[PDB]
């Protein structure tokens, strides 16, 4: 309770992640995202990068859960800019919000590495809802827009970080495996959104961006489950 159905059409993973032509089956990629056989480098550790990967079609699931496995790797104790996980009405292939479009209709879960407001509260994981009219407040790390958040250093961890994001009965729950160990099921609570309203149909997505400082933002897998 509830039961999960794996949804291949809204998922990707290795070890044959890309097709013979380097495309990701069922997903569109844009900007400087680089797909490969065992991961997508959504944005590489170069200056001023943007990249994204979005499902080609909308999903229509009443309740759902995504498990996203990733690394954010950089030479410095401080990195930028971060990675975003999305469920939104429209594809946001390119834009200023962690590589994706602003003014989305849905939810973004932002893994924000860089402390733009100097509040000494990064890296942070920030959940921001939007109806299509709100501009992401990048300068303040979306602080006044955040439905819920946690502080979690997802950078430079020895094992892949995992985010399990569950939309169930109008609530959104984010659990995080911090990647300190190779135990892939070691999740800890991050944040929960009550009265979470999202579109009935929408694309899933992942995106990343860099600035003057730059990490490699790598996604090893994005696994989507329908909950019934």
């Amino acid at each position: 309770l509830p039961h999960r159905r794996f949804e291949y059409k809204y998922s990707f993973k290795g070890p044959h992640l890309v097709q013979s032509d380097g495309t990701v089956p069922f997903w569109a990629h844009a900007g400087n995202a680089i797909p490969s056989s065992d991961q997508i480098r959504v944005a590489p550790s170069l200056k001023s990068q943007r990249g994204s990967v979005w499902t080609k079609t909308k999903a229509a699931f009443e309740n759902w859960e995504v498990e996203v496995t990733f690394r954010v790797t950089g030479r410095g104790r401080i990195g930028a800019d971060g990675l975003a996980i999305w469920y939104a009405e429209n594809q946001g292939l390119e834009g200023p919000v962690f590589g994706s479009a602003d003014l989305w209709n849905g939810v973004g879960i932002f893994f924000d590495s860089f402390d733009n407001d100097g509040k000494k509260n990064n890296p942070a994981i920030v959940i921001i809802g939007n109806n299509g009219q709100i501009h992401y407040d990048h300068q303040n790390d979306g602080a006044s827009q955040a439905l819920a958040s946690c502080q979690r250093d997802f950078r430079n961890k020895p094992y892949p970080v995992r985010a399990k994001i569950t939309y169930y009965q109008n609530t959104l729950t984010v659990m995080i495996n911090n990647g300190f160990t190779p135990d892939k099921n070691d999740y800890e609570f991050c944040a929960k959104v009550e009265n979470m309203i999202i579109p009935a149909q929408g694309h899933f997505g992942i995106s990343a961006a860099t600035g003057g400082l730059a990490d490699d933002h790598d996604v090893l897998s994005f696994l989507t489950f329908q909950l019934t």
Partner: protein
């Protein structure tokens, strides 16, 4: 040389990349050979016919029918 039942289990095992002894739609997409829409049609068909509990996975018995 491998028998019919042996090549079938070999095909199943060779495409079970995560080792969970089940095939999912992504694994099945690698086990053909086309457009993504044709691929979807084929995979949806296999799941419809094989996946008895509708969890998105098929075991060897279901695959082998």
């Amino acid at each position: 040389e491998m028998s019919p039942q042996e090549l079938q289990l070999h095909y199943f095992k060779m495409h079970d990349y995560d080792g969970n002894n089940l095939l999912d739609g992504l694994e099945l997409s690698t086990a053909i050979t086309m457009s993504e829409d044709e691929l979807i049609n084929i995979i949806d068909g296999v799941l419809r016919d094989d996946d008895k509990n509708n969890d998105g996975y098929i075991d060897y018995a279901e695959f082998a029918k």
